[PDB]
């Protein structure tokens, strides 16, 4: 739990982070989908508990630089992410 892992639940393959889920879907319900129609909440076969699936941390990276004709130092901008988590 709580890391970027490649998971395989009943032949359903995926990659992401598995977290303890506070979702409360009824006992007969098995899977959980979202707006984009993909499974984000799952129930383990061995032990009937609820897990939330979250894609691993990703983002965009851009480079700030002056002209190479005058210097070659650069800076890095990570877009839309608190860099205490990079």
């Amino acid at each position: 739990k709580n890391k970027c892992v490649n998971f395989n639940f009943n032949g359903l393959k995926g990659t992401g982070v598995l977290t303890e889920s506070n979702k409360k879907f009824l006992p007969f319900q098995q899977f959980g989908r979202d707006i984009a129609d993909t499974t984000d909440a799952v129930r383990d076969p061995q032990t009937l508990e609820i897990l939330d699936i979250t894609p691993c941390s990703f983002g965009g990276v851009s480079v700030i630089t002056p002209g190479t004709n005058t210097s070659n130092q650069v800076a890095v901008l990570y877009q839309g992410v608190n860099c205490t988590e990079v």
């Binding site: 894609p55 965009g60 839309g80």
Partner: peptide
Amino acid sequence: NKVTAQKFKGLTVLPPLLTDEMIA
């Protein structure tokens, strides 16, 4: 006041360069 969302698919919104306070 009179004028008024979690996409993991790869769609992002970039903030504008000019903040509202500078426009004001």
